[PDB]
Chains A and B, each alone.
With several copies, the nearest count.
Chain A
Amino acid sequence: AKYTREDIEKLVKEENVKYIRLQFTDILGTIKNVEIPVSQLGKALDNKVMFDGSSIEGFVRIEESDMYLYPDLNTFVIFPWTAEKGKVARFICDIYNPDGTPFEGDPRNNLKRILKEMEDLGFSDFNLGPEPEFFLFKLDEKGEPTLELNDKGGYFDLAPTDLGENCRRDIVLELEEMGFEIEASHHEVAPGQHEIDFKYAGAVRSCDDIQTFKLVVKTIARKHGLHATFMPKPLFGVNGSGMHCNLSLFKNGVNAFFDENADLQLSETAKHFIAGIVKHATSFTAVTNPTVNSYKRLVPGYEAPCYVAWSAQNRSPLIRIPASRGISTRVEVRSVDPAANPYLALSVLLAAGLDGIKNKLEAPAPIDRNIYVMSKEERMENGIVDLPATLAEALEEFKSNEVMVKALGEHLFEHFIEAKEIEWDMFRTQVHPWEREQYMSQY
């Protein structure tokens, strides 16, 4: 693998570790942990620390239920900013039912089982090189997050970046001292925006970083006086944070999507793939774009997709075939926002892909003119189905299709719609400040 038992153990004694934190990820995505002391590292490795497991069903825990923690030896890491009275390490863990069996429900082990299905089809890997975007807001005397951007830079800007770069370097020159292989960082479209992109990786191995990232970014941004946030669309009219998911399937150590003397150097392997991701783009959006605000991002304009279709040159495409090819030949799914559970996204995404490759669905006409000039009628005319308008319509369709529900699996599916219609009724029963400024003097 990567780290061995006697391997970890020497890293701790020499590095002087005084506190181990056992990370796993909840359903809404939230990276929660269960903290134990180096004194108990042994029973932790032995896969024997139990814990109330419904901490995963989020704010829909019905019953306390004992579960285990099987820590991956490779997801091991020590923390630098916690480098004083005994640095403070963290692993990432495989939740397992009490008897011996994996937890059906664990977001993570669900990607591994949507991954088993991959091998059973012949592929050897899967790859995710995600570009995650984030605003950096200033805190205050008190320490509260305000609505004041950290900067006023724009696309790829320089001198203005410095106030948020002063951080973007701090963030990026620490992840290196964390083991990361960060491809690179620039500055995004609207002010305060920023984006760092790292090296692709295997599904699990990567989402493992997704989580990590979101966390080291906020840890380091607060240690600067600002509040890193990943809201899809935090400010109105201003551009939203996204988190594109460049994918690529391998099969025996070699890019399956690559094909030299083929229409667009594309294989009849990547076509059926694009075909599938075009065949559930509206029914996996609940998962990919899972919150109520993720739909204030998907408004035509700010580069965010709004309609289903693909190309290799387009304003806001649902799919996007990066041009570089070979071992880099990839499909970029641009709708996924950083408010999406890494794990469950890769699930509906590699499952809507592998229902094409098998069934052999056939991809549609890649676009080039405009899907913005023909209304909702002249568009729902040629297999151009707009992505959902609200979490709620987003759920309506998610339930509507079998292939997906089987993609999470009864327990995960059920608690999710469950955890998510709740999120919807509150926001729907709520009266906001807008509804008020409007109608108070007109009515």
Chain B
Amino acid sequence: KMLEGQNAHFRYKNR
């Protein structure tokens, strides 16, 4: 889930 948040984190830096 950090992995979802991190995942989440990752959708607005890699875009």
Using a CB–CB cutoff of 8 Å, the interface residues on chain A facing chain B are 28, 58-62, 154-155, 189-191, 237-239, 299-304, 306, 315-316, 370, 372-373, 422-423, 426, 437-438
Contact = CB atoms under 8 A, between A and B. Distances in A.
Nearest to B5: A301
Contacts of B15: 437-438
Interface string B1-15: 111111111111111
A260 B15 CA distance: 46
A301 B7 contact: yes
A302 B5 contact: yes
7 contacts: A189-B12, A237-B8, A238-B8, A299-B5, A372-B2, A426-B14, A438-B15
Q: Which of A299, A302, A370 has the most CB of B within 10 A?
A: A302
A372 B3 CA distance: 9
Contacts of A190: 8, 12
Nearest to A372: B1
A406 to B, nearest CB: 26
8 smallest CB-CB distances across A and B, nearest first, come from A301-B5, A301-B4, A59-B13, A300-B1, A372-B1, A315-B2, A302-B5, A302-B8
Contacts of B1: 300-301, 306, 315-316, 372-373
Contacts of A315: 1-2, 5
Nearest to A371: B1
B14 A59 contact: yes
A300 B2 CA distance: 5
B9 A59 contact: yes
B12 A238 contact: yes
Interface of B: 1-15
Given A301-B7, A302-B8, A58 B13 contact: yes
A238 B6 CA distance: 10
A60 B6 contact: yes
Contacts of A437: 15
A242 B15 CA distance: 22
A62 B5 contact: yes
A239 B14 contact: no
Contacts of A28: 13
B10 A422 contact: yes
Contacts of A373: 1-2
B8 A316 contact: no
A244 to B, nearest CB: 15
A306 B3 CA distance: 13
B6 A301 contact: yes
A193 to B, nearest CB: 10
A300 B3 CA distance: 8
Contact of A300 (B4, B13, B14): B4
Contacts of B4: 299-302
A301 B12 CA distance: 13
B2 to A, nearest CB: 4
A289 B3 CA distance: 23
Contacts of B10: 59-60, 422, 426
Contacts of B5: 62, 239, 299-304, 315-316, 372
Nearest to A418: B6
Nearest to A438: B14
Given A239-B8, A301-B6, A372-B2, 7 more contacts: A155-B9, A189-B8, A239-B12, A300-B1, A300-B4, A300-B5, A301-B4
Contacts of B11: 237
B14 A301 contact: no
A60 B9 contact: yes
Nearest to A154: B13
B3 to A, nearest CB: 7
A397 B7 CA distance: 27
A322 B10 CA distance: 25
B12 A303 contact: no
